[PDB]
Design an enzyme around this catalytic site. Structure first.
Site, short mmCIF file in Angstrom:
data_model
loop_
_atom_site.label_atom_id
_atom_site.label_comp_id
_atom_site.label_asym_id
_atom_site.label_seq_id
_atom_site.Cartn_x
_atom_site.Cartn_y
_atom_site.Cartn_z
N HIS A 1 -6.20 -5.94 5.12
CA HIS A 1 -5.38 -4.98 4.39
C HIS A 1 -3.96 -5.46 4.15
O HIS A 1 -3.30 -4.95 3.23
CB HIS A 1 -5.37 -3.66 5.18
N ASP B 1 -11.33 -5.31 2.27
CA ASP B 1 -10.27 -4.51 2.86
C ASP B 1 -10.92 -3.21 3.34
O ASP B 1 -11.41 -2.43 2.52
CB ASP B 1 -9.18 -4.22 1.82
N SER C 1 0.80 -1.22 0.00
CA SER C 1 0.00 0.00 0.00
C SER C 1 0.84 1.29 0.00
O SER C 1 1.23 1.73 -1.08
CB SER C 1 -1.10 -0.12 1.06
C1 HFJ Z 1 -14.63 5.35 9.03
C2 HFJ Z 1 -13.41 5.03 9.87
O1 HFJ Z 1 -12.65 6.26 9.99
C3 HFJ Z 1 -11.34 6.15 10.49
C4 HFJ Z 1 -10.49 7.26 10.51
C5 HFJ Z 1 -9.23 7.13 11.01
C6 HFJ Z 1 -8.76 5.89 11.48
C7 HFJ Z 1 -7.31 5.77 12.03
N1 HFJ Z 1 -6.56 4.91 11.38
C8 HFJ Z 1 -6.61 5.18 10.00
C9 HFJ Z 1 -5.60 4.32 9.19
N2 HFJ Z 1 -4.31 4.46 9.66
C10 HFJ Z 1 -3.45 3.80 8.97
C11 HFJ Z 1 -3.32 4.44 7.54
C12 HFJ Z 1 -3.26 3.38 6.43
C13 HFJ Z 1 -3.17 3.99 5.01
C14 HFJ Z 1 -2.77 3.16 3.92
C15 HFJ Z 1 -2.68 3.69 2.63
C16 HFJ Z 1 -2.98 5.01 2.40
O2 HFJ Z 1 -2.88 5.54 1.04
C17 HFJ Z 1 -3.41 6.84 0.86
C18 HFJ Z 1 -3.39 5.84 3.48
C19 HFJ Z 1 -3.48 5.32 4.78
C20 HFJ Z 1 -4.27 4.11 10.99
C21 HFJ Z 1 -5.24 5.02 11.80
C22 HFJ Z 1 -5.05 4.65 13.36
C23 HFJ Z 1 -5.36 3.13 13.63
O3 HFJ Z 1 -6.70 2.93 13.29
C24 HFJ Z 1 -9.60 4.80 11.46
C25 HFJ Z 1 -10.89 4.93 10.95
#
Ligand code: HFJ
Ligand code: MG
Length: 270
Positions: free
Chosen positions: A247, A218, A96
């Site tokens: 993922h 995912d 990713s």
């Molecule tokens: C409706 C649900 O809203 C949400 C808003 C916020 C989070 C917080 N999460 C979000 C995801 N974080 C990792 C990012 C992965 C990623 C991979 C590729 C990419 O490419 C652009 C961008 C990001 C971890 C972070 C804290 C642990 O959950 C979770 C849910």
């Protein structure tokens, strides 16, 4: 002061062959995530693995909070790594975040990439009126606002659904081991940066062939995002949706995912 690109990124070289496969690990892991894939590559390919800056295995004194607050900082680092090791026309395989850093790098240095193999890529999480990435801007804003004081509780709370694995599973334990190996301020910086990305304007400038490998389920990547990438990339592309969930299917479901990755490494788009 950084004296060696190779040591700073924990670069590892194995194998031999006319073509080099370069492996990029993605958010929250390090190059150890590739351990089951590598043995299938070494007889046919040189293999280069590296850790991106800010992984827990890297020196925090080299983490530049300005450069790594945008994805292109990682893209420019990747070019430097490839040049340091005299790699060109590589087969870049990334999870990713790393696959998207390589896509951007390939715009600036297409000569360094024969093709990209991308596991679970997305160009943008945040919805617009015309683009569905899965996440509403305002919910993201408020979740990131309290990220520092909640990093562990939020990460532990979402990781089983992110990975599609049980809290007590080996995959969960391994992901959390590397995720919490980052220094907390560095982890929060990287998290904010990747959540804020919009690489949609870059896609038409990507010309190297892209192999997009997706889980059927995912939570970070709607299946429609794979089709969006296919339609908007500037070069050849193929999308494979695997019977996996999670993922990081290479970590949680290697019995399905490793053969898929190997096929896309070995077979070029015709
Ligand atoms: C409706 C649900 O809203 C949400 C808003 C916020 C989070 C917080 N999460 C979000 C995801 N974080 C990792 C990012 C992965 C990623 C991979 C590729 C990419 O490419 C652009 C961008 C990001 C971890 C972070 C804290 C642990 O959950 C979770 C849910
Ligand atoms: Mg477009």
């Amino acid at each position: 002061g950084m004296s060696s690109i190779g040591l700073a990124h924990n670069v590892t070289i194995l194998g031999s062959g006319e073509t080099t496969v370069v492996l990029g690990h993605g958010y929250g892991t390090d190059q150890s995530v590739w351990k089951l894939l590598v043995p299938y590559l070494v007889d046919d390919y040189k293999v280069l693995l590296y850790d991106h800056m800010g992984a827990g295995t890297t020196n925090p004194d080299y983490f530049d909070f300005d450069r790594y607050s945008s994805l292109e900082g990682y893209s420019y680092d990747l070019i430097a790594i490839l040049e340091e090791f005299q790699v060109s026309k590589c087969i870049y395989v990334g999870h990713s975040m790393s696959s998207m850093a390589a896509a951007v790098a390939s715009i600036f240095r297409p000569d360094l990439f024969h093709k990209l193999v991308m596991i679970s890529p997305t160009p943008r999480l945040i919805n617009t009126e015309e683009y569905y990435g899965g996440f509403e801007q305002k919910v993201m804003d408020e979740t990131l606002r309290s990220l520092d004081e909640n990093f562990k509780s939020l990460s532990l709370g979402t990781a089983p659904l992110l990975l599609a694995c049980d809290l007590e599973s080996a995959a969960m334990q391994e992901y959390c081991r590397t995720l919490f190996n980052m220094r907390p301020d560095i982890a929060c910086c990287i998290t904010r940066m990747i959540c804020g990305l919009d690489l949609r304007p870059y896609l038409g400038h990507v010309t190297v062939p892209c192999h997009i490998i997706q889980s059927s389920n995912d939570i970070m990547v709607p299946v429609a995002v794979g089709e969006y990438l296919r339609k908007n990339l500037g070069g050849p592309s193929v999308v494979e949706v695997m019977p996996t969930e999670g993922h990081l299917p290479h970590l949680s479901m290697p019995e399905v995912t490793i053969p898929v990755v190997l096929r896309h490494i070995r077979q070029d788009i015709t």
